[PDB]
CSV table of N, CA, C and O in Angstrom, one decimal:
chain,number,residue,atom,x,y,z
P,1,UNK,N,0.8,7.6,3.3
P,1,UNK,CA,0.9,9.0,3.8
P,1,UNK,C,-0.4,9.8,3.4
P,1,UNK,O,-1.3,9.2,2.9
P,2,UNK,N,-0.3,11.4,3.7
P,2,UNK,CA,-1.2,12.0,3.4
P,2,UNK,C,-1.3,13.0,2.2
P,2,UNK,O,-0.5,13.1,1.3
P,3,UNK,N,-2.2,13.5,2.3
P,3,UNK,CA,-2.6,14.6,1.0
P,3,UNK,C,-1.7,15.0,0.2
P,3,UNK,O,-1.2,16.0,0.7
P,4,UNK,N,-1.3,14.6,-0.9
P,4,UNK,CA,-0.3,15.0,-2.2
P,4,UNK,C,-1.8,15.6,-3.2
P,4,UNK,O,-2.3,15.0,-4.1
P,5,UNK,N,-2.1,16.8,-2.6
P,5,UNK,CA,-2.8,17.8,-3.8
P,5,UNK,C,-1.5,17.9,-4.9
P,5,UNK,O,-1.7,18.5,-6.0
P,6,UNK,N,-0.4,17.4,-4.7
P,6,UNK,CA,0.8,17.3,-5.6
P,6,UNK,C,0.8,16.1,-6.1
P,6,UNK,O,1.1,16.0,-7.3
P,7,UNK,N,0.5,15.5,-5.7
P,7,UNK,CA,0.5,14.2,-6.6
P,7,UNK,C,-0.7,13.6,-6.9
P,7,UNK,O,-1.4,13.0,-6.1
P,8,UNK,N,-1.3,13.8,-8.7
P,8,UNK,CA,-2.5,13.7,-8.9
P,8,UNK,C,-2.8,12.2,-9.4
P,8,UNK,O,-3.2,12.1,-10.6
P,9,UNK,N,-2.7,11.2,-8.7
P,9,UNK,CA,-3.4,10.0,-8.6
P,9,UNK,C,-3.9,9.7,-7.4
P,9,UNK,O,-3.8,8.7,-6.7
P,10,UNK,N,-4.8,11.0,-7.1
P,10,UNK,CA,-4.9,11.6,-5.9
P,10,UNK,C,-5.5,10.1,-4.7
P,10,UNK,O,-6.3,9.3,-5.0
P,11,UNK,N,-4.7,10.2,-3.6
P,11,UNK,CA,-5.7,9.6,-2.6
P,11,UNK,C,-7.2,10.4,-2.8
P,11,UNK,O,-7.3,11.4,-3.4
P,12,UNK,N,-8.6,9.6,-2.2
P,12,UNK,CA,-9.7,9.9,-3.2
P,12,UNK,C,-10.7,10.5,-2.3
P,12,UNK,O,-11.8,10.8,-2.9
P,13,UNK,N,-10.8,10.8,-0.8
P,13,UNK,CA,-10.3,11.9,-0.2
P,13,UNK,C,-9.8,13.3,-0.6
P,13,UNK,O,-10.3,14.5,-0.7
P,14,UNK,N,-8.4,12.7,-0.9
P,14,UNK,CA,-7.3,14.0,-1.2
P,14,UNK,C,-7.5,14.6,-2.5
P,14,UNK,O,-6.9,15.6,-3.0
P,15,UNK,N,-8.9,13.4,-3.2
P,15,UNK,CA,-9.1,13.6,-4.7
P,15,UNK,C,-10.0,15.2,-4.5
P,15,UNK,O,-9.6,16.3,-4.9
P,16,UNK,N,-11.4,14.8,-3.6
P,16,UNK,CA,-12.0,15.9,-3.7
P,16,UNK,C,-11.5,17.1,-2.8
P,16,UNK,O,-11.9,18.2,-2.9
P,17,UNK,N,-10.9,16.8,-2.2
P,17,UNK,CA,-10.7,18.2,-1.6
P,17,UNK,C,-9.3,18.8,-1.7
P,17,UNK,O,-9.1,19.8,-1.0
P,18,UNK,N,-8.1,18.3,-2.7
P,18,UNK,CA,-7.1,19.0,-3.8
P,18,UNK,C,-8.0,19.8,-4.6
P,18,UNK,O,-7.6,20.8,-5.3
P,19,UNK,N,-9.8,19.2,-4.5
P,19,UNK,CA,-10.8,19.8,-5.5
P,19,UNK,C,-11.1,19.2,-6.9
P,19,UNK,O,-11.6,19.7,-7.9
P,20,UNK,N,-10.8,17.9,-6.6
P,20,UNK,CA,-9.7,17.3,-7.2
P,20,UNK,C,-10.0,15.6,-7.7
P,20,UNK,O,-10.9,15.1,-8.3
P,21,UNK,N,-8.8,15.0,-7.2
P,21,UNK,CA,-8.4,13.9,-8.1
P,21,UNK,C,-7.6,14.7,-9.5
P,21,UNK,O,-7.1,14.0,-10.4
C-alpha cells in the first residue's frame, strides 16, 4: 500500500516526504 507517514519504517519515498523515514 501507500504512504503510512504513520507508520515509521517508512516506505523510502514515504521516508522523505513524511520528511522522514
Amino acid at each position: 500500500a501507500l504512504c503510512n507517514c504513520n507508520r515509521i519504517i517508512i516506505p523510502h519515498m514515504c521516508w522523505k516526504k513524511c520528511g522522514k523515514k
